[PDB]
Amino acid sequence: GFGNGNGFG
Amino acid sequence: GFGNGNGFG
Amino acid sequence: GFGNGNGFG
Amino acid sequence: GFGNGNGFG
Amino acid sequence: GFGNGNGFG
Amino acid sequence: GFGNGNGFG
Amino acid sequence: GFGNGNGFG
Amino acid sequence: GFGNGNGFG
Amino acid sequence: GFGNGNGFG
Amino acid sequence: GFGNGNGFG
Amino acid sequence: GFGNGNGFG
Amino acid sequence: GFGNGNGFG
Amino acid sequence: GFGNGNGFG
Amino acid sequence: GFGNGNGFG
Amino acid sequence: GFGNGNGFG
Amino acid sequence: GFGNGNGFG
Amino acid sequence: GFGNGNGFG
Amino acid sequence: GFGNGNGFG
Amino acid sequence: GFGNGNGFG
Amino acid sequence: GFGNGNGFG
Amino acid sequence: GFGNGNGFG
Amino acid sequence: GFGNGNGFG
Amino acid sequence: GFGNGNGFG
Amino acid sequence: GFGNGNGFG
Hints:
The structure is a homo-oligomer of 24 chains.
Chain A: no helix or strand
């Protein structure tokens, strides 16, 4: 799923 | 230079 | 969410 | 001096 | 660093 | 037990 | 691993 | 009665 | 921008 | 999240 | 799937 | 000086 | 079937 | 210089 | 894995 | 004289 | 990443 | 005279 | 070195 | 009945 | 048997 | 096998 | 270790 | 700091 820092902008 | 979520894999 | 420098006034 | 948009870096 | 579940080979 | 491929992701 | 029942000979 | 290595899984 | 119902997976 | 009828395997 | 009532013996 | 409903966000 | 220090990279 | 599990032998 | 020089921000 | 961190190693 | 001179104006 | 970005490198 | 089977017996 | 190299891996 | 002091690989 | 010069790179 | 007269930049 | 003769004003 989410894998390392993710960009919910 | 780089946004909110970016994770050098 | 904004880019590079941004001041409004 | 400088104006309001001062994102340097 | 991979995925949800992991056993190998 | 199921075998080596797994991880409903 | 191999399978759920096993007595290789 | 069952034979030599087997299993159903 | 973000106000009404949503999810991201 | 999921959908309604999901019986793994 | 597999079913109910599967007895062996 | 600005307007009552400003939201650039 | 694996030999000395392993290399799952 | 070396990478992972660089077994030698 | 990477090699030796790694200058992340 | 170069970058954030170099590691000749 | 910005080098040697860095003189703003 | 010196002025900005006086950077020989 | 060796993992299949051998004839030294 | 067996007595030599016989891995059965 | 076999012959001499052995050094099979 | 190998002799006694064994620096390994 | 390393070689003779190593000096870095 | 390097070899011969450096002026730079």
